[PDB]
Amino acid sequence: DIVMTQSPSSLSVSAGERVTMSCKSSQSLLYKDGKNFLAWYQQKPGQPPKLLIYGASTRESGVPDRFTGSGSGTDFTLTISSVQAEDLAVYYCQNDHSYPLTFGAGTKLELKR
Amino acid sequence: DIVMTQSPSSLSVSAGERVTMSCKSSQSLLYKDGKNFLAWYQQKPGQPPKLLIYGASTRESGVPDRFTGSGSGTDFTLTISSVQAEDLAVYYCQNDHSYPLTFGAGTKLELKR
């Protein structure tokens, strides 16, 4: 199996500020076409996961530009440039093409008052 | 988008007994080869989702036979024939081939003392 290592496990930030979170895979996710088979999901409290990004950096429809996914091969990043109250959630990265498909353990993002 | 309707939302059962939970998709998931593009994930408390079944009824490696997925087209079922303490989790079904990929809202399974 492909192990996805996420960090940090949790962070606390005030609104409007930048955060970065890391996801490393134990195997390369990069394919022939320059394509990285890596998704990011957001799971708000009491809700199912929702696909935010696939292909390492393509945002889904409706996902704001304050989310950016980057990186390639094994080392990926999700940055939120200005965190807002509705971004409170657990973020997971996933190996989404090589079975069994595997999530990392998540980064919990909490808002500071 | 494909909407996945799960029911029931929660249930409480004693160990060793049978439970069934339903997942309906608003569009047919059945493809040309007899193939249904439907996965079930299990999410234990504080953990990421883990893929249990894909193709509507193929169990992943290591998943015990007391899990069975069935159904076709729009109407799917996950049955656990003898629920054990480690099956405590939220179960999600997912449209896993038609983007954006979509989870249902989950069935929370809780053990009765």
d(CA A106, CA A86): 17
Choose the mutation target among A6, A53, A103 for the interface with B, i.e. most B CBs under 10 Å: A103
d(CA B27, CA B98): 10
Say whether A106 and B48 touch across the interface (CB within 8 A).
Answer: yes
Q: In what order do the strands lie in the sheet with A67-72?
A: A4-7, A19-25, A75-80, A67-72
- The one-letter code for the residue type at A34 is G
B105 close to A (CB below 8 A): yes
**Residues B61, B67, B71, B76, CA torsion sign:** negative
d(CA B71, CA B18): 18
Query: Residue B26 — left, alpha, or beta (φ > 0 → left; ψ -120 to 50 → alpha)?
Result: alpha
Cα B27 to Cα A113, B12, B73, B74: the distances in Å are 43, 30, 8, 6
Cα A77 to Cα A7, A55, A67, A72: the distances in Å are 10, 12, 10, 9
Q: What is the resolution of this structure in A?
A: 2.0
d(CA A69, CA B91): 28
Taking Cα atoms as reference points, which of B45, B74, B72, B73 lies closest to residue B57? Answer: B72
Which residues 74-103 in chain B show a CB within 8 A of chain A? 92, 99-103
Provide CB contacts within 8 A for A87, sequence distance 6+. Answer: A42, A80, A109
Between A48, A60, A105, which is nearest B106 by CB?
A48
d(CA A106, CA A22): 10
A60 close to B (CB below 8 A): yes
B56 half-sphere exposure, CB direction, 13 A CA radius: 20
What fold, for B1-113?
Immunoglobulin-like (2.60.40)
Say whether A51 and B104 touch across the interface (CB within 8 A).
Answer: no
CA angle at residue B34 from B33 to B37, to 5 degrees? Answer: 95
Domain boundaries, chain A: 1-113
